[PDB]
């Protein structure tokens, strides 16, 4: 349970959308509605948790830093997502649909797989720890040479605790990408959401908490596009 609250982009400060109570403020998140989770994969629901769109863009060049807070978030096991999304034009005609989103970054689970497995609680395997707790951040640089223009950035957690229960908690806002860049992912780095995985999949439904498995977890979606 929790959402992306605000957000730090190229230094300046971006409130969020206030989920639980909007202010009818303008801001550069799209809508969420409350800390619930996505359950289906299959769910439209998983793209930008409902919202539809935004008033305000942050600018940024590429190799900028994009940092999300976290005002709570309660789940230590599972990865993180972050995507970005090529706007053909306006933002307010973007609904992220097809096969535009491409993962800049992304963190998974780094335990020994022998005294931290999988499903241990403390001290736990997974970078996600790490947001736990209050106004915790996550920094990920936008890839050097992305071509400029209107881009949708989109932070995901999927919370694992609940064996083949997953939880997708996700949230979009608004980047216009300043300079010449050219680069563009090519289409092996692009992914639909929802579409990227399938509820099925080994590392979307699965038991956590056996530990005859290979304590290995594969992050889902595309590799990551790293530019130039
Ligand atoms: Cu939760």
């Given at each position: ?110 335990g020994d797989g022998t005294t931290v497995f999988l ?6 395997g ?88 290979p304590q290995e ?12």
């Amino acid at each position: 349970h929790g959402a992306v609250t605000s957000y730090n982009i190229a230094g300046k400060d971006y409130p969020g959308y206030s989920g639980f109570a909007p202010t009818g403020q303008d801001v550069i998140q799209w809508q969420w509605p409350d800390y619930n989770p996505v359950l289906s994969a299959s769910d439209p629901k998983l793209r930008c948790n409902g919202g539809t769109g935004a008033a305000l863009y942050a600018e940024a060049a590429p190799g900028d830093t994009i940092t999300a807070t976290w005002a709570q978030w309660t789940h230590s096991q599972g990865p993180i997502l972050v995507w970005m999304y090529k706007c053909p034009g306006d933002f307010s005609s973007c609904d992220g649909s097809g096969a535009g989103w491409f993962k800049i970054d992304e963190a998974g689970f780094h335990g020994d797989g022998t005294t931290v497995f999988l499903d241990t609680e403390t001290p736990s395997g997974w970078d996600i720890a790490k947001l736990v707790g209050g106004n915790k951040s996550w920094s990920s640089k936008i890839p050097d040479g992305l071509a400029p223009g209107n881009y949708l950035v989109r932070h995901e957690l999927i919370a694992l605790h609940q064996a083949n229960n997953p939880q997708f908690y996700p949230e979009c806002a608004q980047i216009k990408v300043t300079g010449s860049g050219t680069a563009e992912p090519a289409a092996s780095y692009k992914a639909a959401i929802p579409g990227y995985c399938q509820q099925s999949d080994p590392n979307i439904s699965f038991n956590i908490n056996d530990h005859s498995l290979p304590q290995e977890y594969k992050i889902p979606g595309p590799p990551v596009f790293k530019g130039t």
